[PDB]
Amino acid sequence: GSSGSSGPKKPPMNGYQKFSQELLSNGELNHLPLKERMVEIGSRWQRISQSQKEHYKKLAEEQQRQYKVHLDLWVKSLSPQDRAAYKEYISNKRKSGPSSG
């Protein structure tokens, strides 16, 4: 059991991971061990049609899109002490872009 973990959730990449996560969150193959689950999944994924994969693939794009802002939304919540830290890593990483006018 469990309740809540973090704002954004590690989204998929291609799309196959999307459908899987579903079978992992659904519990359709909760009768077998993870091992089987996975393999079992890969199979089920090999059953669906292009559409499905395509759909899940499209979603992945949206999921990864939302997770982007979500990260910020989670920041907007980050206290003045936490955010002060999180940012510490932000500035460090990437390279803010200046402006002229």
From Swiss-Prot:
Parts of the chain that traverse the membrane: none
Domain of life: Eukaryota
UniProt protein name: Nucleolar transcription factor 1
Protein species of origin: Mus musculus (Mouse)
Subcellular location: Nucleus, Nucleolus
Entire protein: shown range: 567 to 654 of 765
Subunit (UniProt): Homodimer. Part of Pol I pre-initiation complex (PIC), in which Pol I core assembles with RRN3 and promoter-bound UTBF and SL1/TIF-IB complex. Interacts with TOP2A in the context of Pol I complex. Interacts with TBP. Interacts with TAF1A. Interacts with RASL11A. Binds to IRS1 and PIK3CA. Interacts with DHX33. Interacts with PHF6. Interacts with CEBPA (isoform 1 and isoform 4). Interacts with DDX11. Interacts with NOP53. Interacts with ALKBH2.
Residues recorded as bearing Phosphoserine in the entry: 25, 79
Annotation: DNA-binding region: 9-75
PTM statement from Swiss-Prot or TrEMBL: Phosphorylated and activated by PIK3CA.
Free-text function comment from the UniProt entry: Recognizes the ribosomal RNA gene promoter and activates transcription mediated by RNA polymerase I through cooperative interactions with the transcription factor SL1/TIF-IB complex. It binds specifically to the upstream control element.
